[PDB]
Structure formats: C-alpha cells, structure tokens
Ligand binder design. Structure first.
Ligand SMILES: [Ca+2]
Length: 112
C-alpha cells in the first residue's frame, strides 16, 4: 500500500483489502501526480468505515488528504466527507491505522 503513484487523470484508490478490514499499524500513502493545471475532484464511493470515537475527533485511524498548503481531514467514522474539490494537480492521500479495530476502510474515485 506504501508507494502508490497514480499518473492517469481518472482513477480509484482504496484502503488495503477494501472492503476487508485494513491492516493494523499502517502508514499507507497514495499520490496523484499529474501535470500542473489539472484540477482534481475526489469522491468517496461506497462504504466509509474508519475507526472513530463518540467524544474525541478521529484518534486511532484516519484518512488525511494534503495538497499544496491545503490539508483536508483527518477523517473517520461511518460517513465520508462530501466530494473534495482540491483545485490541485498533486494530492497526497495519507491513510493511517493504529494497532486494533475491525473497520473495512474507504474508497475514493478521483478525476481531473
Ligand atoms: Ca484501528
């Protein structure tokens, strides 16, 4: 999972094993790298199941998305963020899980 470069203008990224449980203690990243000027809308499709908490924001596990200075997330829980219009050509999706949990992960489809 660590060393995903995406060079095509549309595509689809998922948590390892999605929709099986994603592995524990996992520092997985995903890069979308396209020519500057391309503009990337990210959509979460299907089931967003990242481990969550009732009272405290997204400890444990989480997807973060970084472009330029802009940083979306960290996200977790059973409901995915609304589509993200990054207005960027180069996004780092970072996903991170701790050492326990039984969540099935996430799935996004990008396009530019
Ligand atoms: Ca976990």
């Amino acid at each position: 999972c660590s060393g995903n470069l995406f060079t095509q203008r549309t595509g689809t990224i998922t948590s390892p094993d999605y929709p099986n449980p994603y592995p524990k203690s996992s520092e997985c990243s995903y890069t979308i790298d396209l020519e500057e000027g391309f503009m990337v809308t990210l959509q979460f499709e299907d089931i967003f199941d990242i481990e969550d908490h009732p009272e405290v924001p997204c400890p444990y596990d989480y997807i973060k998305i970084k472009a330029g200075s802009k940083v979306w997330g960290p996200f977790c829980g059973e409901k995915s963020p609304e589509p993200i219009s990054t207005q960027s050509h180069s996004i780092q999706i970072l996903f991170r899980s701790d050492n326990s949990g039984e969540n099935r992960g996430w799935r996004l489809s990008y396009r530019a």
